[PDB]
Structure formats: structure tokens, C-alpha cells
Amino acid sequence: MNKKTIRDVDVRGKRVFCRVDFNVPMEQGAITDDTRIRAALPTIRYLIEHGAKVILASHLGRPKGKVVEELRLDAVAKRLGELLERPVAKTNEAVGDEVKAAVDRLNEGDVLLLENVRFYPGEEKNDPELAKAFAELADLYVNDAFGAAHRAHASTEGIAHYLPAVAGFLMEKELEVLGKALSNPDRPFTAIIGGAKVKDKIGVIDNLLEKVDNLIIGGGLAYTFVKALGHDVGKSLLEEDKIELAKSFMEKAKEKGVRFYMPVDVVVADRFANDANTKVVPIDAIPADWSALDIGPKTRELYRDVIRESKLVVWNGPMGVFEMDAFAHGTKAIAEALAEALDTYSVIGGGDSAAAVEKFGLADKMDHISTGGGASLEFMEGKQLPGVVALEDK
Ligand SMILES: Nc1ncnc2c1ncn2[C@@H]1O[C@H](COP(=O)(O)OP(=O)(O)O)[C@@H](O)[C@H]1O
Ligand SMILES: [Mg+2]
After folding, report:
1. I want to staple 63 with a disulfide (CB 3.0 to 4.6 A). Which of 27, 68, 171, 357 is the partner?
2. CATH class of 1-170
3. Between vectors from CA 70 to CA 64 and to CA 74, what angle results, nearest 5°?
4. Residue with the nearest Cα to atom 18 of ligand 1?
């Protein structure tokens, strides 16, 4: 919230450097999923329509500061032109005289895609010299890549010290929804935290406990908490070194008046495989030589009931090993409960969690699916993302 956007500045006839996220999956030089390109169109179309000279910048993969032929942006330029139904110029460098000549040749409404910014070693180091070379190409900077704003790189932060800097439309949606969930939530406010390791979620659980009414835990994360309560977890994922941290979090929940929910039943398997023998058991009776890979039927029911009584729900992390169909039921049940809750606003964050919802075909039934991956989690921890801080306040 409070950042200026492209709607707040006149872009007619200005050279506009726009950081976008075109880091798409490829195989054999062909794009296999263009979702991220599609997500950038609203911003891009607005700029074209209003007469900006549009300069797009993105990274693709991890070239490590050198040219990697296979990570050039030609395929993306091609695909963008198809979607816009207008040619997209594309250079083989991102700075330098050839690039200055290409920007100079742009007319109002024209689009130019620069080569992969991570071909340059100063990008990931945030070198001011690279930042200044980028800034020399334009009049204004637009940041529409929330998934890259959590690290201070020349194209996501450095350049904003030299030009007026505003948010694109995707950036604006992420800040408004996530910002409001942390700053002024609708209540009851429930957070659902799953995934594999508590190690990965320490910051998120810590910060959400200062805000929510209810905290629900699932995934492999939950077995560290069950062990903390004195129950054996058989062969389940466990982080013994975090047992004391788990007891502190439960004590923080009590002190704050938060209702804390964890599984009452689990789906256990005799082997880590889709065709393993499985059975349902209560949480205090996990067989010593079996593994719990999903939440059970009574837990799905209980979680659905809490979701139904909440006005806002933030969910990060699968409830079980959803990659295997036999252990995907708990994850599916949470997605379906959110899709069907008439007065509950749903926010989803995390790579696997977004994938899971897409996989079940429920993405359009959710209020907001964060695009930021790791940047969404860091935002939820209460961190100040460098790319966000650099943008001007309205
Ligand atoms: N009971 C479990 N045992 C082992 N791994 C689990 C369990 N429940 C969930 N996971 C795993 O959690 C992983 C997703 O966790 P995470 O990466 O933190 O989610 P996100 O990307 O949504 O933040 C998936 O690979 C899944 O198989
Ligand atoms: Mg993940």
C-alpha cells in the first residue's frame, strides 16, 4: 500500500525501464509454461497505450554472471510478440552502445526486451556502475517483479537510486493484499502453515503469532511439534534441534490468546511410495516404524470447520506429500474448504502451495495467489524488501 504506480505519472513519450519477471520454464529451447509472461500484460499494455517507449528487463535461470547461450531471452521475446500481437525488438546485450542505439530508435508505443540481466556479474552484486548504465537508458523506472524485490540487485534496487521509481500493476496487487493482511486483517484471522521443515518457517510463524486469532499447522512441520508434546512420530520428518523452539511457539500462542490447532489423525505409510501400504491412526499412535505423510480425515474436518468460521485465511505449505496421489487428500481438502467458504477471503503464498491449487483446478476460486514465491514469505516475516523500500510513496 502507499506506493506510487504507473497510473500516478505521465508516461507519454518517456523511456520507461520496466523490471518484469519472465523467468519461465523451458525445455529444448521452447517455453513450457508462459504464465509469467501473461501475468505482465496489463502493465505492458497500459504503457504501450499511453505512449511510453517500453524497455523490458528480466532474468532467466541462473547464468552466474556470464553469457549462457541457452538462457538468452529470444524465445520469450517471440512469445511476448505473439501475445501482444505487435513486434518486440530484442538486443543481445543489456547495456552498451548497441543497446543505446536500439532505445534511440524506439517510437511511442514500441517495445524493446533487453538480454538476460544476470549475464552481468554486477547485477547480483548490485554494482552502482551497472545500476547507472541501466539508468542512463530511461526517464522512469517501473518495478513489476515482486518475486525478485526481496534481493537488492542492480535491476531491482540499484537503478531506483537514480530514477523516479513506481510500481506496476502486479507489484501493486501484491503490496495491497499482503500489506492489508499484515496491517489490518479482517477477523477472525487464521493462518495455516504446512510444508516440510520448521526451519524454513520460523520467521513466518513468529510474525503471524503476533497477529492471528487461529494458527493451524500441518505438513512434515507438524511432527516436530507432536514430538515436543512427548509423542513418538515413528519414521516421520523431525528436526530434533528445534524441539525447544516448537515449545516456545506453543507458549507464545498461549500468552497471545491464539487458538493453536495441530493434527488429531494422520495417514501413515510403511514405505515412501505411492503404492505403499497405508492406514489412518490417531496422532498419539503413530507406529514406530511407519511414516506420517498426510493429515487424516478427522483433521481435514476440523480444519474445514475453523476455515468456515474465519473471515481471512493466509495459507502457506502443503498438508502432506501431495506429489504422490495417495498423500494428496489432506492438501486437496484444505483447497476445497477455501474454495467453498462463502465469506472467507483466501490468500495463498509459496511455490508448492500455488502449484497444488493449480493442480487441483481451484486457482480461480481463491481471492489471491501470490506470485512472489520466497519474496512472499519474507514479506510475511515482517522483512522490509529492498525492491519495495526503493519505490516512491504516494
Ligand atoms: N508429512 C510430510 N513429510 C514429508 N514432506 C512433507 C510432508 N508434508 C508436506 N511435505 C512436503 O512439503 C513440501 C512443500 O513444502 P514447502 O516447500 O515449504 O511449501 P511452499 O513451497 O508452498 O512454501 C512438498 O515437497 C511436500 O511433499
Ligand atoms: Mg516449496
Report:
1. 68
2. alpha beta
3. 110
4. 195
